[PDB]
Amino acid sequence: AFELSAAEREAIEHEMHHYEDPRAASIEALKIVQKQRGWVPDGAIHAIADVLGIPASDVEGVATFYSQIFRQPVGRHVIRYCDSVVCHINGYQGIQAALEKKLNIKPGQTTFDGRFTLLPTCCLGNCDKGPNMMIDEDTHAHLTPEAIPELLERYK
Amino acid sequence: ATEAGLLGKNIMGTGFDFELFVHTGAGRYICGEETALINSLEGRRANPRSKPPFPATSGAWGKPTCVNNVETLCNVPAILANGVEWYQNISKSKDAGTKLMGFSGRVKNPGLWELPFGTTAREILEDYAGGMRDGLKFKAWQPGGAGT
Amino acid sequence: ATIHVDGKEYEVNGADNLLEACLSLGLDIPYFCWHPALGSVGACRQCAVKQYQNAEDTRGRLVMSCMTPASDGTFISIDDEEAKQFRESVVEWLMTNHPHDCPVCEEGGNCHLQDMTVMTGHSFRRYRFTKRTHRNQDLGPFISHEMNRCIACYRCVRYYKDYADGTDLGVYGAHDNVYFGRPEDGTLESEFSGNLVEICPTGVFTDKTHSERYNRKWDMQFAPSICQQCSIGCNISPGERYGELRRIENRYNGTVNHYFLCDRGRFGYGYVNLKDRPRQPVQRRGDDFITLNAEQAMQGAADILRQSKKVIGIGSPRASVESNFALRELVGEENFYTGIAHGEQERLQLALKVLREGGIYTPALREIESYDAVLVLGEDVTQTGARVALAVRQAVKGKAREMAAAQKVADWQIAAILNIGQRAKHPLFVTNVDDTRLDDIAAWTYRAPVEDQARLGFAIAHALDNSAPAVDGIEPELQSKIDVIVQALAGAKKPLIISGTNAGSLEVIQAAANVAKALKGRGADVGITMIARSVNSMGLGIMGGGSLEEALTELETGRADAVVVLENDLHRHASAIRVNAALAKAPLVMVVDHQRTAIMENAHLVLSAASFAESDGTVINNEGRAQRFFQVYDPAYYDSKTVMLESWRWLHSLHSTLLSREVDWTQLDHVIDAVVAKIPELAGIKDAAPDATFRIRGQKLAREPHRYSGRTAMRANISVHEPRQPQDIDTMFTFSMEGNNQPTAHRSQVPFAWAPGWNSPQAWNKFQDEVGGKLRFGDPGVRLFETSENGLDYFTSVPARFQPQDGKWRIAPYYHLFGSDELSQRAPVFQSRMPQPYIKLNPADAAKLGVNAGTRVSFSYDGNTVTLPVEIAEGLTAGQVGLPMGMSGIAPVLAGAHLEDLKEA
Numbered sequence A: 001a002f003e004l005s006a007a008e009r010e011a012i013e014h015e016m017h018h019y020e021d022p023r024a025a026s027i028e029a030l031k032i033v034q035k036q037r038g039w040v041p042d043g044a045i046h047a048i049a050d051v052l053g054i055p056a057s058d059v060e061g062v063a064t065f066y067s068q069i070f071r072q073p074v075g076r077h078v079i080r081y082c083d084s085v086v087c088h089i090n091g092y093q094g095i096q097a098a099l100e101k102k103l104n105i106k107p108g109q110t111t112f113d114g115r116f117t118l119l120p121t122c123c124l125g126n127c128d129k130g131p132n133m134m135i136d137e138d139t140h141a142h143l144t145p146e147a148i149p150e151l152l153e154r155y156k
Numbered sequence B: 001a002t003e004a005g006l007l008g009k010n011i012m013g014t015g016f017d018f019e020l021f022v023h024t025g026a027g028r029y030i031c032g033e034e035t036a037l038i039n040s041l042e043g044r045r046a047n048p049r050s051k052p053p054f055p056a057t058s059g060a061w062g063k064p065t066c067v068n069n070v071e072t073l074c075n076v077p078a079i080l081a082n083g084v085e086w087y088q089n090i091s092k093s094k095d096a097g098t099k100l101m102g103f104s105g106r107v108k109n110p111g112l113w114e115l116p117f118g119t120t121a122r123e124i125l126e127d128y129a130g131g132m133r134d135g136l137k138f139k140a141w142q143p144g145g146a147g148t
Numbered sequence C: 001a002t003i004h005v006d007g008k009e010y011e012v013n014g015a016d017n018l019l020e021a022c023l024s025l026g027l028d029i030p031y032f033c034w035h036p037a038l039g040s041v042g043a044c045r046q047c048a049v050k051q052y053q054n055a056e057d058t059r060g061r062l063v064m065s066c067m068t069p070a071s072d073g074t075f076i077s078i079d080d081e082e083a084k085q086f087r088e089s090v091v092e093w094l095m096t097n098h099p100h101d102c103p104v105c106e107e108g109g110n111c112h113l114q115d116m117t118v119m120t121g122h123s124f125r126r127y128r129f130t131k132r133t134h135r136n137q138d139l140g141p142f143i144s145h146e147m148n149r150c151i152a153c154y155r156c157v158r159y160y161k162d163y164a165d166g167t168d169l170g171v172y173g174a175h176d177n178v179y180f181g182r183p184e185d186g187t188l189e190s191e192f193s194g195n196l197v198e199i200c201p202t203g204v205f206t207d208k209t210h211s212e213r214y215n216r217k218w219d220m221q222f223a224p225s226i227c228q229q230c231s232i233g234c235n236i237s238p239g240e241r242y243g244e245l246r247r248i249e250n251r252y253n254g255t256v257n258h259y260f261l262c263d264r265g266r267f268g269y270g271y272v273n274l275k276d277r278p279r280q281p282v283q284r285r286g287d288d289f290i291t292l293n294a295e296q297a298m299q300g301a302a303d304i305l306r307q308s309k310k311v312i313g314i315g316s317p318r319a320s321v322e323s324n325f326a327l328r329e330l331v332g333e334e335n336f337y338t339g340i341a342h343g344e345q346e347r348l349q350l351a352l353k354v355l356r357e358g359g360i361y362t363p364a365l366r367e368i369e370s371y372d373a374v375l376v377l378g379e380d381v382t383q384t385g386a387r388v389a390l391a392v393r394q395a396v397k398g399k400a401r402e403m404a405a406a407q408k409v410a411d412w413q414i415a416a417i418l419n420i421g422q423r424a425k426h427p428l429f430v431t432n433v434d435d436t437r438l439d440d441i442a443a444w445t446y447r448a449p450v451e452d453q454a455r456l457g458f459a460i461a462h463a464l465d466n467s468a469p470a471v472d473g474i475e476p477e478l479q480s481k482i483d484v485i486v487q488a489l490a491g492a493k494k495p496l497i498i499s500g501t502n503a504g505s506l507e508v509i510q511a512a513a514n515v516a517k518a519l520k521g522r523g524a525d526v527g528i529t530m531i532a533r534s535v536n537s538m539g540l541g542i543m544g545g546g547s548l549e550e551a552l553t554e555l556e557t558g559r560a561d562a563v564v565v566l567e568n569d570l571h572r573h574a575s576a577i578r579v580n581a582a583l584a585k586a587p588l589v590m591v592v593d594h595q596r597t598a599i600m601e602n603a604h605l606v607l608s609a610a611s612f613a614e615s616d617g618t619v620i621n622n623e624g625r626a627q628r629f630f631q632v633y634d635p636a637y638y639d640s641k642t643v644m645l646e647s648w649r650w651l652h653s654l655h656s657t658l659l660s661r662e663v664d665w666t667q668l669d670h671v672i673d674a675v676v677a678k679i680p681e682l683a684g685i686k687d688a689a690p691d692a693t694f695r696i697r698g699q700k701l702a703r704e705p706h707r708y709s710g711r712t713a714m715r716a717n718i719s720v721h722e723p724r725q726p727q728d729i730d731t732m733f734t735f736s737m738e739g740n741n742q743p744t745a746h747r748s749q750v751p752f753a754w755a756p757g758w759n760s761p762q763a764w765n766k767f768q769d770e771v772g773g774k775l776r777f778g779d780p781g782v783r784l785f786e787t788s789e790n791g792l793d794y795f796t797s798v799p800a801r802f803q804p805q806d807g808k809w810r811i812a813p814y815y816h817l818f819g820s821d822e823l824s825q826r827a828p829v830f831q832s833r834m835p836q837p838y839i840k841l842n843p844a845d846a847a848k849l850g851v852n853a854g855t856r857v858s859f860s861y862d863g864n865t866v867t868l869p870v871e872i873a874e875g876l877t878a879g880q881v882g883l884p885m886g887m888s889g890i891a892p893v894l895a896g897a898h899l900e901d902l903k904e905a
């Protein structure tokens, strides 16, 4: 049983005002639900579709198209390490190995206490300061495998 | 800019109305392709579209639409302020104006510098990027991103 | 436009793309994502050809032929080396993940992907890595889902969402993990979901009803036939194997249904395979039932009929023209009765009078898609005439088509057309007792009683033309909506008015005729469509006869002591108590039918008639087109004890045995000539198909593919001696593969599409003049009547507004595509799809009765106190109860009737 909160519904309608078609608010409606609840659960697809007046199949096609809209439950903090070409040259593999050793999980997995979800991501547009990674809204550059356990500890 | 009359209704008393919005993405590389950008702005899956028709005649929601890069739109105000003749005489090359160029990846000074068109890649690599790092020999380079 | 293909000059349409132009010329270009009805999108990249700007150009460039206009002066090569290598590479890329599934795949031998793999010449696998896999979904009882076989051609979503306006199918995921299906498990809710099995070029979407008793396409015995499940008359290709009807495929008719059926026609055929069907004539002696052969049945029935003082006949709209005529000849014209009720007959003859005397052209089903504004009055088209609802959706998309044509966008560039149009569409106004499935695209929906819908129509006609009679007592809000409808219809270049007999009111048909007349008087190109109930309702109305009530009172007064009932259960058109009493009073009841009906418990003789799969005949659809259906198989080929004949054959031999004491089994063309000699209004049924002497260069038309298998084994358990193939003296088709099915054969009746290299439904390309157009020697079927020179007068009988009165409940008809048709609701696959029985109530009326949603209420109609659970209907107007017509115990004659003693029990 999914119900959109008042804050979620008002945010979705306010974003509906920004376009000439309410369908154009589907991505940000999914992002609003994800920001409130960590991810987009299954009933949120039908709730968002009902608010925007578009089919649930379109909402789910959007949600499963875009990589940053999570349709599976994640941890409290999403680590997104860049695995693209410049960070590969700058040695993201050591960063990924350090993250895997500290968290004892694989990419795409969530730690057993629900704290961290480790994810590869495409280039973060910070290639001159690589290797880069992204915790929830914070980007960390100039990464070394030694600074990974200290820098992960400030996200509780 | 909205507070100081530069955006919104009756900008500078000219009668021109302009609303500027920011649409934050949800993380796909294909969304940068202009027709897939238009599809993503419409709240759909970001597949590109066949051209013709180009977005200039039927783009976002079927309306005339122009998609331009950040740096292109950042180039236009200096053209409008300092004139066309200043912009043509920035460099003696077929490509007018200045381009943000740079070198990245195990160089001494990886970064980003505004340079006229026609500067050599060796000038960017050695004078600006500082050359390769110590103990590393130059093997290859990609000029313009991962797709070159 | 002149194009050059591989150094050969061709004359093509410049408004077409290169793929459809080259396929219309007989050239072979492989393709997946393009469809003639869906336009071009350029997804699969299979249709690559090399293009040259000049004749003196040798480099060229690979282009998509589906995305390239066939303009004047283009040079292309299909057989270029780079083009062939690229098309083979596209097939190979599709093969990298494709499962090793062809032996256990229902698409095998009918698969477009198999055909294009062979056509490109790709037969060697060098990919050595893993293949991606997908889980499947449960899509309901009709469509089986297997996503491993998907080639991501996007045809399913383009058809289902853009064409059919369905909402519950979509594409999910990303790069090589794209998934096509529903957002979750559940039944596909579109009434036209079944066309996915032919639209999908692979075995992802397959016919589950056929999959239960699966056979390959080469093993099938096909015939051209007409769907019997409603009045639209969509052309079908039924196919059988081992004596059972295995599958209903779409038979392409470029004038009626082209590529698409509805799900009632596609999946409601299962009543043909019921094990309780009569296979032999059976005579009742006391409590005993004795099986007779054909001659003893004819002799005994003729003896009892000779002893009888008056024999009356009761026809049916289920039966063909020839069967109803044969009954009419057996009993006499003055003793013939149509099997429908008096009100149903009045509405049907009024609809026929409007069609062939109103002076307004009635369009064919394909022509509906070209109209500019649609007004549907009373007729719940999606549940009663579903393919008309699909065609109306296309007509509504016509506005985006017009806007895109204004911007010089080609008509096959469907994505650009849809982008330009956005949400703009042509006006659609629908009226019903409740909400319709057309309300998503309707400009306005009027939920009102049938009298109020008729009054709205009369007001529309009066505002269009002041000579039309006025209706007083219209609210200003309803007046504003009326002016909206009037401004839409008056500005339309081609308005269309749809009505029919299913609303159960004469005044709705009269109001639709008044609106059409008012639009015609303004010099508009107005069309009118009437939706009838059954497959041959219009033919029965043209033939005419007394109502079922007159036959019942003739049997009840004792003036008739013998009744012959043809293909009629009699409970759908009259109260079962009255029918049972009248049939028990009659000393002789003969029932000629192919289904085990309830009136055979009192029948003294039951003649095992053939269904449409085992019979030939002619049916008249809702627009007056006579269409011939042909027998699919001989039911006595396996079971020699089966005596199952055409109804007209039974009744003609009965008349012969009654007159000259001798049996005459006759021929179909003799009966057709008798029809056109006796009834001049049915004279067009002679030209519906050529007679049985028609040949293609001396050879008959084959019913089964040339690779039909098992001839010396399929009957070998019965007897090791192979019999003769059953003979077809009735038609030009042969019950074997020893015949003609060439795509260039000069004929109109095509039993199935097959061409060398094209085993899928894409083989219909070779049978058309141009792809997506007409069959290349004309579509089968002929219109019985032309548009009359003069129209009718305005109907001045404007009804008063609906008034609720206490203790009296007006029955609002609720039709269901799965359930409201008698024979298809007998099919076992429809039982899961059929809704649970219910009674619809307004919230105010349910609160007044002290009744919540789900509680059972009991009501009495004609001595039948039945109980039904309550569903709350917001849109139903108070003073009405909604009833599902045509279900078990709810006859469609109850539409517009009243109800007493509705209480919670």
Ligand SMILES: Cc1cc2nc3c(=O)[nH]c(=O)nc-3n(C[C@H](O)[C@H](O)[C@H](O)COP(=O)(O)O)c2cc1C
Residues within 6 Å of the ligand: B029, B030, B031, B032, B033, B034, B035, B067, B068, B069, B070, B072
């Ligand atoms: C796959 C793909 C991704 C692209 N991503 C971007 C992008 O992220 N940003 C961008 O400005 N252009 C991107 N482009 C180029 C655009 O299609 C288009 O040329 C540009 O956005 C606007 O043109 P302009 O350079 O004249 O401003 C991409 C093109 C392709 C084919």
Ligand code: SF4
Residues within 6 Å of the ligand: C098, C099, C100, C101, C102, C105, C106, C107, C108, C109, C111, C112, C113, C114, C149, C201, C202, C203, C204
């Ligand atoms: S979809 Fe076609 S190619 Fe694939 S397994 Fe089925 S028959 Fe074979």
Ligand code: SF4
Residues within 6 Å of the ligand: C149, C150, C151, C152, C153, C154, C155, C156, C157, C180, C199, C200, C201, C202, C204, C205
């Ligand atoms: S399911 Fe069928 S129609 Fe849909 S994309 Fe896949 S192969 Fe094409």
Ligand code: SF4
Residues within 6 Å of the ligand: C227, C228, C229, C230, C231, C232, C233, C234, C261, C262, C263, C264, C265, C266, C385, C386, C387, C388
């Ligand atoms: S619309 Fe009517 S005639 Fe056509 S397939 Fe459906 S039930 Fe059959």
Ligand code: FES
Residues within 6 Å of the ligand: A082, A083, A084, A085, A086, A087, A088, A122, A123, A124, A125, A126, A127, A130, A131, A132
């Ligand atoms: S390559 Fe990693 S931030 Fe760009």
Ligand code: FES
Residues within 6 Å of the ligand: C019, C030, C031, C032, C033, C034, C041, C042, C043, C044, C045, C046, C047, C064, C065, C066, C067
């Ligand atoms: S048929 Fe042309 S690209 Fe698919």
Ligand SMILES: [Ca+2]
Residues within 6 Å of the ligand: C614, C615, C616, C631, C728, C730, C731
């Ligand atoms: Ca026959």
